[PDB]
Assembly symmetry: C3
Homo-oligomer: 130 residues x 3
């Protein structure tokens, strides 16, 4: 999958790397994909450029908040549930980010909807599985 | 849903917050979700960073152009059609943005594809909806 | 469709425009859409802000790496395969970007999920086919 993060400015480069490493690990373990299946962007925002409330659930938000949008081929409900739990556990333990500050939206596509390089559709050619 | 706006730089902070409030209102009006079901991001762009034409329709575009991308569980065609009209209505009235300067694309997902907090899938657990 | 690019900072305005023009052409060639069906954004990143490996495929990426996200109504598998090829071809010829530096992910939607202007759902009204 592709992991796109929206965060506020204020982290050091190492803290941003840490966040990305922690999240990548959670994804690999929840999804069972290769360790080098790593595709991640970070967009940093000024105050004002995100409004992230809680739908009345009683979260907890700060300027440390992390919004993650994932584009992925179909995963089981169990894999998605586990990814969410692994993600917040990693970001808490590794980065000191409260689980109240993590929000994830996932969108799905399929085999023909990826090219990782060279103009090839690797899920279609079978270079990747599949 | 999650509302992601791409706009050009130039608005003041209060003008940005107006676009966000106007759009959020429209969304609540069209979709009937809780008022605090508010998830929005804004990416501001230098000249050059968007090219947005009109497929020959005759719109009107300026530096005020707003591109909105929505991630949402399925809504009806009716709800979508109403959203678009509500959205440009509110942006015109509240923000002075011509409806010519508004573009929307929506993509859909499912109950399992959201986590609003704490690693929980609240549509799956039944905490929402 | 809508084409959203994530790239690293460092290109001149002309190089950004070259990259968009190139990508646009390849899209129009693959998909058979009007030349003015042009909707593109670019988000530029500091080093650190993208990590793009290769799943062991043996691709040699550089800082020129382009990540493209496409939102589109359904196209045939052939058209998608053709787009990826034409896109890399064009980015290499027109921009000097290695095909190893081009990544694409596509997400689909449908007729009711687009508003190009005026809060009109043009695929639904028939303004566009």
């Amino acid at each position: 999958p592709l992991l796109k993060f929206d965060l506020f400015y204020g982290r050091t480069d190492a803290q941003i790397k840490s966040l990305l490493d922690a999240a990548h690990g959670a994804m690999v373990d929840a999804f069972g994909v290769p360790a080098n299946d790593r595709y991640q962007t970070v967009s940093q925002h000024r105050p004002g450029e995100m409004v992230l409330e809680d739908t009345g659930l009683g979260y907890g938000r700060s300027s440390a908040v992390v919004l993650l949008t994932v584009i992925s081929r179909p995963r089981s409900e169990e894999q998605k549930v586990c990814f969410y739990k692994l993600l917040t556990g990693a970001l808490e333990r590794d980065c000191g980010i409260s689980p109240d500050d993590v929000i994830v939206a996932l969108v799905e596509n399929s085999d023909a909807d990826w090219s990782f390089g060279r103009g090839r559709a690797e899920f279609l050619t079978g270079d990747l599985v599949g």
